[PDB]
């Protein structure tokens with residue numbers, strides 16, 4: 001499968017034609033305020049430099065594979081382990097976030113993919129209710145260099161080639177997310193890539209994270225993808241809610 | 252294992268000592284109104300007179316085996332199939348509901364146990380979030396003989412002895428439940444019997460159903476359990492919420 005065109009994703013995986021897909025357009029004035037939604041809690045996300053982490057250009061994104069021991073709770077009894085993080089972005093003068101807010105597409109988006117502690121593997125959790133949880137944050141252009149993201153963006157040149165990987169030092173993975181873990185949207189959806197399996201709990205932060213204009217150009221302008229094309233515009237079209245309600249942790 | 256005695260349930264099943272157990276005490280005061288909670292959808296519950304259904308005294312309860320085709324949804328793409336129903340009740344002058352409201356125990360409680368249709372088998376669903384869902388309603392004393400419950404209560408005689416069973420004509424299962432499918436409490440917990448697996452979505456109807464004083468007497472005074480003892484007070488003590496917030500489908 002590719003961004004850009006064929007083969008149609010439903011030919012790759014039937015679930016890509018499911019009723020309840022991601023990403024979606026968030027209309028905050030339409031979200032349901034759900035006081036049950038408590039602040040997210042993260043344990044083990046402040047990694048030491050060793051062991052190193054694998055950073056791979058898989059031709060679809062840049063993916064940082066995370067080690068065991070990164071724990072995330074959506075709430076009491078809603079426990080997950082971090083697997084990996086990756087990014088979605090656009091191209092020069094073209095934003096590339098997957099989620100939109102009132103139709104606004106942000107420059108880029110980070111996903112941290114988590115597996116429920118009730119499942120040993122991703123393939124057993126696919127299509128199961130709450131089997132996977134994704135933490136998603138918008139990346140916006142700011143005046144300051146982001147020193148957290150620089151640790152990864154300074155390595156993109158080494159993995160310019162599709163199917164390339166390098167080893168990078170451990171870093172504070174939580175420093176790639178917003179500081180406010182109390183204000184977020186939550187809804188049930190799918191993988192945004194084949195096989196597009198449903199039952200994913202999506203948490204989208206209210207607060208965005210700021211990268212510099214040059215950091216965002218590095219992200220969109222360094223990696224190469226399938227055929228002989230730049231890895232850019234690696235985002236899926238917004239999918240209809242089809243009756244799903246988006247919840248908000250805040251009034 | 253048995254009710255009020257030995258062995259200690261955590262000796263039979265350590266899962267009984269989990270932190271997110273059922274049943275719980277509901278404080279409607281402290282429940283979070285979640286506007287996303289839609290009316291319950293129950294299709295295929297109006298069974299024809301034949302085939303007949305197995306009703307069994309298993310020594311812990313009276314359990315009705317439900318046939319294939321009873322489909323239930325808690326929300327978009329969150330679908331279930333009904334397996335069985337059973338009851339919890341007290342004794343002469345003593346209430347025996349499992350759930351309580353502001354400390355009040357109701358005479359009795361009905362449980363309709365469902366399997367997520369994301370799982371081909373019950374054994375895959377046990378311990379997985381949302382694998383099982385129970386619809387719970389409190390039974391109260393009314394002035395009128397309940398027609399629905401009469402079909403089951405009139406047959407308790409035939410199965411008074413622990414382990415005995417009888418075939419009963421098909422009935423409308425939906426008629427055992429309360430009037431308003433839009434008004435309920437929901438939280439995540441456990442089986443209330445060993446092995447006390449967690450991941451169970453509990454939906455407790457705001458509204459009660461009414462049985463005659465006589466009907467409640469028949470329920471609590473016809474069945475015999477383990478040893479030579481009456482099958483009575485077959486409920487578990489309420490369990491701490493341990494940070495879980497009970498949600499309400501209604502303001």
Ligand SMILES: NS(=O)(=O)c1cc(C(=O)NCCCO)c(Sc2ccccc2)cc1Cl
Nearest residue numbers: 065066068081083084113115120121122123
């Ligand atoms: N790169 S990943 O997004 O992080 C990831 C993680 C796991 C995984 O299940 N287990 C590790 C977690 C243990 O805590 C698997 S499973 C699998 C499925 C189909 C085919 C082959 C393997 C696949 C992926 Cl793509």
Ligand SMILES: NS(=O)(=O)c1cc(C(=O)NCCCO)c(Sc2ccccc2)cc1Cl
Nearest residue numbers: 060061063086111113134190191192193194
């Ligand atoms: N965008 S998402 O909904 O958050 C997402 C993306 C990927 C994913 O890594 N896709 C490839 C592009 C990024 O590396 C995976 S896991 C995986 C699946 C298929 C193929 C390989 C891995 C899981 C999720 Cl929930």
Ligand SMILES: NS(=O)(=O)c1cc(C(=O)NCCCO)c(Sc2ccccc2)cc1Cl
Nearest residue numbers: 311312314337362364373385441442443444
């Ligand atoms: N009280 S309850 O939380 O609703 C409950 C009770 C029983 C049960 O039958 N216990 C014995 C007394 C009643 O017949 C089961 S049975 C079962 C089904 C699938 C998987 C495992 C067990 C499941 C549940 Cl959720």
Ligand SMILES: [Zn+2]
Nearest residue numbers: 086088111192
């Ligand atoms: Zn993604």
Ligand SMILES: [Zn+2]
Nearest residue numbers: 337339362443
């Ligand atoms: Zn029960």
